[PDB]
């Protein structure tokens with residue numbers, strides 16, 4: 001179990017850690033989060049009480065270093081930092097725990113939700129999507145645009161998701177225009193899986209990361225990416241059986257976790273109706289279809 | 301975006317553009333089988349690709365052999381249309397390629413966009429104009445070349461005959477739309493109007509009769525009457 005200490009909490013803020021969240025008052029004696037499960041990536045996120053504009057946060061893996069949060073009164077935000085003095089860090093953490101100034105990561109033992117949402121998400125792949133190689137953790141916020149959005153503005157502050165575009169020369173072989181547009185198996189299996197992602201785990205990891213950025217930061221370009229990666233699979237007549245079964249599980253847990261009140265803005269009616277009811281895979285996503293029809297029958 | 305009543309002089313500016321109509325590509329007769337079921341028999345069709353400024357018509361004849369052993373023919377027909385338009389564009393010298401292609405039916409947008417991905421600078425646009433180009437097969441010489449075809453074939457026509465010697469393209473295209481709309485609304489009446497006077501003939505190299513300017517004014521009035529007439533007989537007015 002690892003710890004992310006906080007130097008202090010000078011401004012009132014709602015703090016998220018993965019799917020959990022809690023409020024900290026201005027100058028409340030709060031010194032961080034303990035008992036963080038080792039073995040998963042995690043996200044710590046922030047919404048200031050005085051400006052619920054700009055949610056922002058940091059993806060990190062406690063196995064890659066000792067990380068802490070410190071408010072910066074010049075830049076006006078809670079910053080993640082790495083402490084290289086491991087003795088200093090262990091000392092600080094021990095003092096804050098003995099004083100009980102930390103919230104405990106509140107995982108129930110029956111609960112695999114976070115694993116199920118991050119199963120294929122790797123810190124190394126996050127750092128390729130979010131380029132800032134001087135840090136081992138990755139900053140994301142609500143406003144960051146994707147490389148595809150920048151094509152359709154600061155490159156250093158962008159989400160470098162894999163560009164998926166169904167009406168593109170990459171997606172469509174000459175002489176197979178109708179075939180490849182109506183059945184995207186070529187684009188999924190040869191271009192994307194074999195060529196770019198190399199395996200389905202990396203594809204699923206990007207899909208999972210895009211969903212989590214959409215949900216935690218309301219990041220629009222991430223939502224676009226998540227839906228495009230679902231639609232590419234659902235619009236392909238030839239998909240490995242194990243990928244379809246895994247996708248059904250991935251989407252089930254995403255739909256299960258989604259705040260009921262955000263479904264109207266985080267779920268694309270067209271993509272989901274197409275995927276569940278018209279596409280090649282309309283009968284292959286049994287768990288996802290059942291939770292969607294029972295939780296969000298309006299959308300359908 | 302879409303072409304409508306606001307931007308119609310755009311059709312007659314000096315940016316090369318083509319209309320594409322696919323309504324006569326896939327044509328069938330429906331009949332009863334010996335067992336009393338129903339079946340279709342395809343007949344030859346055509347893509348109607350028209351430059352509205354010059355009158356040049358690229359009539360790609362679609363021979364029924366292209367459907368042999370294919371499924372979902374109404375869907376295939378849109379993609380075959382887009383394939384042939386793409387081939388036509390590729391066949392033209394760069395300075396003759398269109399800057400825009402306007403499809404008469406929105407279902408042609410994705411097929412054509414996908415076939416034209418190599419030409420990112422050619423705009424593919426719909427129109428809110430309900431253009432009567434389906435009636436092109438009511439022009440006798442076009443119907444004849446389509447039905448006589450025994451293989452795929454492209455035939456070039458000027459659908460304005462020599463009218464541009466005397467009138468603008470805007471006026472020629474308005475006249476063509478009036479004629480085709482009439483032929484679509486009441487083909488028999490329209491053809492009697494066009495052909496009732498035996499002293500006015502169709503030249504061998506033309507599609508329509510050799511009306512004088514004053515005769516065109518008369519013909520055009522008779523076509524408006526017809527479209528109004530049938531509109532009464534239809535809506536009881």
Ligand SMILES: CN(C(=O)CC#N)c1ccccc1
Pocket residue numbers: 308429474475477478481
């Ligand atoms: C429909 N029509 C006509 O019948 C013209 C005549 N007669 C028209 C004319 C200009 C632009 C668009 C349509």
